[PDB]
Amino acid sequence: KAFDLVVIGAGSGGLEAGWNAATLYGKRVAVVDVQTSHGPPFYAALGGTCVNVGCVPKKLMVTGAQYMDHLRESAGFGWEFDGSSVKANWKKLIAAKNEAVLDINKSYEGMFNDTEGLDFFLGWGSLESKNVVVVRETADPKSAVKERLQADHILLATGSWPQMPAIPGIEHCISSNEAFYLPEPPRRVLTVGGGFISVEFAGIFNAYKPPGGKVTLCYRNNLILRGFDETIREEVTKQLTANGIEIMTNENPAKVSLNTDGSKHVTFESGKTLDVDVVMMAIGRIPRTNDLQLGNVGVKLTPKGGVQVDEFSRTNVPNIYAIGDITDRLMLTPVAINEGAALVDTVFGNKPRKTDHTRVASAVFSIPPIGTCGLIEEVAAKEFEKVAVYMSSFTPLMHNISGSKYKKFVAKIVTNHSDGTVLGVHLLGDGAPEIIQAVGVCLRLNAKISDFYNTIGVHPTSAEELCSMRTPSYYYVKGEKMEKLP
Amino acid sequence: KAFDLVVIGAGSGGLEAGWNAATLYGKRVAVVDVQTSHGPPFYAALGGTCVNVGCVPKKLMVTGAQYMDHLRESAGFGWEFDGSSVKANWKKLIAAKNEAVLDINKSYEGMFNDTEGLDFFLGWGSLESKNVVVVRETADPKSAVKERLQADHILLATGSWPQMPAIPGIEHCISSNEAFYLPEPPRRVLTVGGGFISVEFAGIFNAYKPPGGKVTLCYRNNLILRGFDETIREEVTKQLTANGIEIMTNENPAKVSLNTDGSKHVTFESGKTLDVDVVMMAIGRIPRTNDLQLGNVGVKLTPKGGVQVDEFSRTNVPNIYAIGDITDRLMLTPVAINEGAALVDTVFGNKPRKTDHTRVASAVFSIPPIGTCGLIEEVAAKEFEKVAVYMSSFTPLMHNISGSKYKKFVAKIVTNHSDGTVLGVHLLGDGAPEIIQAVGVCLRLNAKISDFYNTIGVHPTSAEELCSMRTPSYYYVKGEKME
Ligand SMILES: Cc1cc2nc3c(=O)[nH]c(=O)nc-3n(C[C@H](O)[C@H](O)[C@H](O)COP(=O)(O)OP(=O)(O)OC[C@H]3O[C@@H](n4cnc5c(N)ncnc54)[C@H](O)[C@@H]3O)c2cc1C
Ligand SMILES: Cc1cc2nc3c(=O)[nH]c(=O)nc-3n(C[C@H](O)[C@H](O)[C@H](O)COP(=O)(O)OP(=O)(O)OC[C@H]3O[C@@H](n4cnc5c(N)ncnc54)[C@H](O)[C@@H]3O)c2cc1C
Ligand SMILES: [Br-]
Ligand SMILES: [Mg+2]
Ligand SMILES: [Mg+2]
């Protein structure tokens, strides 16, 4: 019952910290989670949000969704088949996803049992005192104690949870959690929100919808995917539209009621109405701090609800650290992992290291997908006196043959024009998530635009566009966009 | 007619040099090629080998071939359709490819019309003298003169040509050139060679073959794709085999005759026989120097027939340069382009620059494909005292669901273990050619393994494997492999 490190949350960040502390530094580690395998009632489980109801299953379902486009696009290359026979069997997809996630859950179980001084505790972790974690049977602080864990160090890694807007009939709506377990693909679905989760699920539902189906995505402001490159936000909007998805911008649900046939009657703030079979709320995720009883040891939270941390993931309380989504910064699995690895290298390895939250490669598995690393130009333009934007945007030859002429591949490089330093790279198109990873390494190396254009292309690829851009398309000078420099 | 530059060969390297000299340096430029659009009789044409009978059409046809796998793989993700209705229509593929290539041909025609100081001449270019290119009706040097072009500077950029072994019945075989024009997909095809062209065409023919068809690839040596990472050579062999291609290693045709039905009867050196509809020779490509009459000016060739060049693409004759496949080095379109641009900057810009032929990213559009940049470990091990190999090799989760469980993604990083400098990166699997491009940029920046592993992954991707390898799988110490 005594440990060097107790981790509350067996997710992306918590398991990296846990495994590393045990296997690299022979430390004695307890990891707490509420559930050993995916799905209801608690959705996240051993492996965390990404494994159970996040990156892993989402990516398999987007891959499944992509076959709608491959089956159509095949015709341009001479593939012939009975188009009237094509069905998308959602139940098969969900059964395959469930088996894949369960196998990972079982993999993590094997990892704990195989590893000396790495112990999993089932139940709800909360802070009793500075050096004691209590595992209770439920999220109720008044529920039975399963365990009292003595901790030289405590890591909070409980991640996040979907935010459900407090509107009349929210109980008729789902989150991404339930989306992963729908018994039937909805004929009509409203995805609410403009972020990656709404966009990715709109794609998934669009491919698996039964005949006469309709996917509608609503967003409360003007243009989806705030924080992404603007050119790409506009293009993804057009390319989703081109594939049958209705993008309702400047619209937001005011209430939902059940129709007598069990469908949902959505009334928007605008007075507009829409009937759908499923309303999936994807308007935000919020850190899971409530259940940890942070009032008990005085761990400070932010004006947004995330655990306050310094660059070393340290809270205001010595021996207590927080990584990943609970910190409410970049909600990405590899960031959580990086932070956990750095924390353990610092505290147990005597090799202090701070996660770099700049120049983080990331993706949206939209159809087609986004890959991005570093600053968008509007952000660069406020930091740097002179910013250059290099842009290539055209439909690749193969999509002129596929018949998907709307699939413009977008490649943008944003530089500090004073020294050529690449500040950001923004891609839209097939392969963009794969292309961007080694761009992340390029930015860590402070690559300049001349490092890209002096590198020999791989031909033919989309990626070689990044090595073909010599001349800025336009600039920002003291924040002002202009075609040409003074 | 008088030019600052005459380019013989309107291909990858020739058009880059001609266009750069004309537009960046305001030079008067002539460019010669034997055909204005793709296909028989000369196959290459305005735009070069890559445009007409190479990278561009082959990539379209591999993309077409990939649908065989997509259609089958869709089932695991719940897609249903009538499998018995599926037909691969090769005629539609060839038509779509032909339109794509002709549109490029036409666009280059328009580039010459609209670029003042850049003039296209149709016919066969050869050297009359060290400042005169003669353009003739045919490759025969006795054929009619169409033009005589006075040149301050002459660029040889005629590319390469398929090598055909001198075996009995060679006339019953084709090369990649003719493969692009087969009116019907062969039921039985033997691709001869272990290089990328043989492997890429084996995958194309495997997808479009009619019912009950069979693709066989034969190679003289023990393991296809010499020059590539050895793990990847072994895995691509298994993955082709798993998709129904018969890999015949240690086998080479001795002769070909016609069966009474017009099919080809192949006899291998081993005595073994194989009946096929097409025999596609892809055993090599040789520099196209015969027709240039270089004996008129005394340009030095290698015994192979490549044009000898220094690092600045200069021949032994002042004012005569050679770039691209004619130099018989790295036969890649982007390298030819890089050499052309570096030559014109040097000669016309006085901006001295030579092409780095090291750490060139390249691809094989095998199914699944290869992306590679830099040294394989056996080469590194000879040049460096300690070499580390970081290796990740596993069937991605999506291929456990798709049912293609044979599709192992391989990611290998080779380092100078003394300082961690990345020497090579070798990938096999879906996306590899796209992943490897920015890896070329990393190697130009002398990236170390720590620069890869300290970069935060994009998840989930195949590419994040590159940023997840902290610990060598094994080493070479003074050339010897150590576990
Ligand atoms: C739909 C969706 C798609 C996503 N796609 C991607 C993507 O493609 N790429 C990407 O990088 N990121 C993606 N993310 C984000 C990614 O899932 C997170 O950033 C990551 O999982 C956060 O890791 P973490 O360690 O902070 O916590 P998590 O991985 O969320 O782990 C938290 C764990 O803590 C447990 N827990 C919580 N409270 C308690 C308690 N009191 N006691 C015990 N256990 C508790 C939970 O059961 C959970 O298992 C996605 C997220 C979602 C929801
Ligand atoms: C099947 C195949 C697939 C390939 N795939 C790829 C790939 O995916 N990626 C890649 O980078 N490379 C690829 N390559 C290689 C690429 O095609 C070559 O490296 C590149 O085209 C060579 O450029 P170049 O300038 O040397 O000559 P080329 O582009 O071959 O151009 C030479 C030109 O000279 C003309 N010519 C020849 N003799 C004369 C003469 N006497 N007078 C006038 N004109 C003449 C020809 O008609 C031709 O158009 C492939 C090659 C083949 C055959
Ligand atoms: Br061999
Ligand atoms: Mg254990
Ligand atoms: Mg002209």
Residue numbers in the entry:
A (entry chain A): 3 to 488
B (entry chain B): 3 to 485
Manuscript text:
Trypanothione reductase (TR) is a key factor in the redox homeostasis of trypanosomatid parasites, critical for survival in the hostile oxidative environment generated by the host to fight infection. In the case of the Trypanosomatidae, redox homeostasis relies on the dithiol trypanothione (TSH), a peculiar variant of glutathione (GSH) in which two GSH molecules are joined by the polyamine spermidine. TSH is kept in the reduced state by the action of the NADPH/FAD-dependent protein trypanothione reductase, homolog to the human glutathione reductase (GR). TR is considered an attractive target for the development of new trypanocidal agents as it is essential for parasite survival but has no close homolog in humans.
Site 14–15 is located in close proximity to the NADPH binding cavity. The analysis of the unbound TbTR structure made by FTmap predicts a hot spot located at this site, although it does not stand out as a remarkable druggable site. In fact, Phe198 is located over the FAD and, in the apo conformation, its side chain is perpendicular to the isoalloxazine ring. Upon NADPH binding, the nicotinamide moiety inserts between FAD and Phe198 forming an aromatic sandwich in which the phenyl ring lays parallel to the FAD. Therefore, for the NADPH to bind to TbTR, it is essential that Phe198 is able to switch from its perpendicular position to a parallel one with respect to the FAD.
